[model samples]
Target chain A: MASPLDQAIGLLIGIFHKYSGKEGDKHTLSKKELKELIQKELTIGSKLQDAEIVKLMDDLDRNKDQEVNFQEYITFLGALAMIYNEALKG
Target chain B: MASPLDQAIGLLIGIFHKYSGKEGDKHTLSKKELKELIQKELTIGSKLQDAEIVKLMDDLDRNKDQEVNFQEYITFLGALAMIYNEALKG
Candidate 1:
C-alpha cells in the first residue's frame, strides 16, 4: 500500500483537477483561467461571505503576488489537510 | 470522480485520521489525547526538533487559546484543500 502521506497528497491533487474550470476543451490551466474556474466552482456571487472569499484568495495567493501560482496553491492544500487532521484528533 | 481538491482533502483527512492516535483500545480522541497521538505518530521526540514541534502545536491550536477545537480542526482541512488545488493549477 502507498504511504498515507503520499496517498493524501494524491487525493488532494486529483480533487483540484476535478473542480477545475475548463476553457472549452483544453485541459491545461493558466492563472487567469484558474481564478475564473475557482470563482465559478465556489460560486462567490453571494453564497460565500466576502471575508471568506478574501481569506480563500489570500491563502491561494501563496507567492504574495497579485496572482496565485500553482505550486503555492498545492502547498496551501497540504497545510489545510494538516489543520483538519489536527483538529479532529484534538 | 471526486473533485481533486476534495479527494485531496479526503486523502489527507484519512491519512490524518488513519495515523490518529488512539487511546489504547478506545477510538475517540480529546485534545491532550490527540497531541500525544500526533507526537507519537510523527516521532517528535526522535525526528522532530523542538522548533518543529512548536510549529506543529501552533498550527493545531487554531483558536490561539492554546487548544484546538474539533470544529476548528475539520475546517482547517477544507482550507488546505482550497490551497492545494489553487497551487497545482497555478
Candidate 2:
C-alpha cells in the first residue's frame, strides 16, 4: 500500500542497513560495507581500485570516525551528486 | 541501465520535480505542490484535511521560505519517519 515515493525511499533506507549490517557497527557503514556499496551501486565504482576506496574512505573519515552514516554515504555518491544537489538546492 | 540504488535515487529526484514543476518555482515545492505531494504520495495524507496540510506547511516554513526542496519534503514524511531516522542515525 506504499506509494512509489514511499517505496523508493524505503529502498534507500533499507539498502543502507543491508550493507551496514554486514559487519561491525550494526547501525553505521563500515569500510567493507562502503566498498561493497560502491561496487554494487555505482558503475564507475565497480572499476575503482582498492587504493581509491581507501583514499575516499579516508577523506570521508575526516571526522576520524571508524564508521560513517547516511550523510557520508550520500555525500560519497558522486555519481548522483548533480541530482542530489539539485534536490537539495532551492 | 541503473542499479536499484541509482534507480531509487533517481525516483526520489524525479518525483520532486514532477510535483515541483506543477505550479510556480519549477525547482522548489510551493505550498500547493507540497499539498499535492502529500495527497498523491501518502496514504494517510490522502485523508488529511486541508487544515492539517496548512498547519504542516506552516511548520516547515519556519525558515521563512516561500518554497521548499527535497530536505524539507523528506523531513515532512512522518509516515516513514522511523525508517528515515534509522537511515540517518548512526
Candidate 3:
C-alpha cells in the first residue's frame, strides 16, 4: 500500500521524468518551458503563459526556498486535493 | 482511460467544485480561509496561519481574479508534481 506520501512522491517523480528530460536534467521551465514540455512529453500542444507559471511556482514552492523540494511539493498536492473535494460538496 | 488533458480538467473541476464551497459559492478564501477550511474538510487539526494562506491563495488564483477557478487549481497541481520530481533526483 503506497501511503499518501509514497503516491505523492511517485507522482512527483513521474512528472519530473516526463518534463525534465530525465532526472538531473537541469533544464528549468519558464512559461516557454511549459509549452515545450507539454508538447514533447505528452505529444499534445498546450500553452501555459508566464502568469500561469508564476501562480504555479507560488503554490508548489511551499518551503519559501524559491525551489520546490519533495515535501513542499506534496503539500501543494494535498492542498489541491482538499480544495477539489471541498468544492464538490460545498 | 482519461487523457492527461481530461485528467487535468477533471482535477481542476474537482478542486473548484471542492473549495468554492460548491459551484457558485463565492465565499472565496482570504487569510482566514485556510485555517477553517483545512480543519473542517480534512478533519485534520492543522493550524495554518495567515501567511501560509496567502501563499496558497497566490498559487491557486492563477486567473488573477483574486480567486481560484477550476482551471487555475489544476495548473498548480501539475506544477507541484513537477517540483517534487525535480528535488527527488536532483
Candidate 4:
C-alpha cells in the first residue's frame, strides 16, 4: 500500500484528470469540467450555490481565462490548505 | 465518510501535527521530527540517506531558522505536487 502522503499526492493528480478528461482540452478543465469536479469530488463543493461556483471559477482562473489548468488547480488546493490551517489553529 | 479531497487535506494537517508535536515548538517541525515524519510517512523518504535528508531539510527551511513551519511544509507539499505533475506528464 502507498503511504498516506503518497496517496494524498496521487489523489490530487488523479482527481484533476478524472474531471479534466471529461470534455474539451484533456489536459485542462473547462468551466463545465471544473464545476463537475467540485460538485462531485468535494463535500464542501456540494453545498456551494451556482453563484458561488461562478465566483470561485473566476477566482481560480489566474489568467482571467475560462479554463482551469493543473497549475490553477494546484492554487485552489493551496487556498483550501490555508483555510484548513486557519481552522486547525482556531 | 468524507470525500477524497477532504480526506487528503485532513491527512496533510494531521500528519504534520503527528510529527510537529513530537518535540520542540508544538506547531513546527524540528529536523529530527521532519526526518522521522519523512522516514515513516513517505515511501520515497524511507530510501533517502542521511545526507539527502540533511539537504532536504536545508532546502525546506525557507527562513533559515532550522524549523519547518506549516507554511514551509505547505511549500514542500506544493513542490512535491509539481514533481508529481511532471511525472504524471511523462
Candidate 5:
C-alpha cells in the first residue's frame, strides 16, 4: 500500500496527465484543458468564475507560451500548497 | 465532497503538519522529523538508506538553518513532482 504522501504525489501527477492528454500537445495543458482541469479536479477551483480561471491561466503560463506544461502545473501546486498551508494553520 | 485534486492537496498539507508538530518548531521540520516523515510517509523514501536520507536532508535544507520550513518543503515537493512527471510520461 502506498503511503498517503505517496498517494498524494501520485494523484497530483495522475491528474495533470489526465487533463494534459485531453487536447493539444498531449503533454501540456492548453487553455481549455486547464479550464476543464480546474473546474473538474479542484474544490476551490470548481468555484472559480470564468474570469478568475482566465486570470489564473494567465498567471500560470509563466513562459507566455499559451499553455501550461508540467513545470507550470507543479508551480500551481506549489501556490495551492501555500494557500492550504496557511488555511491549515489558521 | 472534495475533488481528487483537493483531497490530494489536503493530504500534502495534513501530512506536513502531522510530522512537523512532533518536535522543534511546530511549523517546520527538523532533520529528525524529516527523516521520520520520509521513512514513514513515502514509499520511495522508505527504502532510502541512511546515507541517502542524510543527503536528502542536506539537499532539502536550502536555508541551511537545520530545519525545513514550509517553503522549502514545497520546493522538495516540486522536485518530486518533476521526477514523477517524467516517470509517468515514460
Candidate 6:
C-alpha cells in the first residue's frame, strides 16, 4: 500500500487527468474540464458560485489565458491546501 | 466519508502540522522538521541525499528565510506535483 503522502500525491496527480482527459488538449484542463473538476471533485458545493468559479479559474490560469495545464492546476491545489491548512487550524 | 480530493487535501495539511509540531515555532517547518518530513513522509527514500535536501530546503524557503511557512510549503508541493505529473506521464 502507498503511504498517505504517496496516496495524496497520487490522487492530486490523478484527478487532474481524470477531468483533463474528458476533452480537448488532453494535456491540459479546458474551461469545461476545470468546471467539472470543481463541481464534482471539490466539496465546497453551493458555497462556490459562478462568481467565485470565474475568479478561481482566472487565478489558476496564471498566464491569464484559456487553459489550466498540469502546472497551473498544481497552483490551484496549492491554494486549496492553503485554505485547508487555515481552516484546519481554526 | 470525504471525497478523494478532500482526503488528499486533509493529508497535505495534516502532514505539515505533524512534523511542524516537533518543536520550535509550531507554525512553520524548521530545518530539522523539514528534514524529518522529507525522510519520513516522502517516498523518495535513499534517492534524496543531504545535498539535495539542502538545495530543496533553500528552494522551498522562498523568501530566503529560516523556516517554511504554509505558503512556502504549498509551493514545494506544487513543484512536487509537477514532478509527479511528469513521472506519471512518462
**Highest-lDDT candidate:** 5
Better of 1 and 2 by TM-score: 2
User: How would the docking of model 2 be graded?
Assistant: acceptable
Q: By DockQ, who's the top model here?
A: 5
Off by over 4 Å in 6: A38-55, A63-65, A86-90, B22-27, B38-44, B48-55, B61-65, B84-90
Runs in model 3 deviating more than 4 A are: A1-13, A23-90, B23-51, B58-90
For residues B1-90, write the lDDT of model 3, one tens digit per residue: 234533543444444344455334443433233344534434442344344345455666655544445445445555544545445344
Question: A9-65 in candidate 5: lDDT tens per residue?
Answer: 677677667667565436566777765655754545455555545655666778745
What is the Å distance of residue A12 in model 6 from its true position? 1.0
Docking quality band of candidate 5, CAPRI definitions = acceptable
Note the residue pairs that clash in candidate 2: none
Q: TM-score of chain A for candidate 6? A: 0.64
Model 1 residue A65 distance off true place after TM-score fit, in angstroms: 4.9
Provide DockQ values for all models, in the order shown: 0.20, 0.31, 0.07, 0.28, 0.36, 0.35
- Model 3 quality (TM-score): 0.35
DockQ order, best first, reads 5, 6, 2, 4, 1, 3
Give the Cα lDDT of each candidate. Answer: 0.48, 0.56, 0.44, 0.58, 0.62, 0.60
Question: Rank order by TM-score, top first?
Answer: 5, 6, 4, 2, 1, 3
Every prediction's TM-score for the first chain? 0.48, 0.50, 0.38, 0.57, 0.62, 0.64
Candidate 1 CAPRI category = incorrect
Superposed Cα deviation of residue B59, candidate 3 (Å) = 4.4
* Model 4 chain B lDDT-worst window of ten: B81-90
Tell me the spans in candidate 2 whose CA falls farther than 4 Å from its real position.
Answer: A24-26, A39-59, A74-79, A83-90, B38-65, B71-90
Rank candidates, lDDT, best first: 5, 6, 4, 2, 1, 3
TM match of model 2 to true structure: 0.60
Superposed by TM-score, candidate 5 places the C-alpha of residue B35 at a distance from the truth, in angstroms, of 3.9
Q: What are the per-residue Cα lDDT tens digits for candidate 3 across A9-70?
A: 45455554454443323433334344553344343223333333454566764444333343
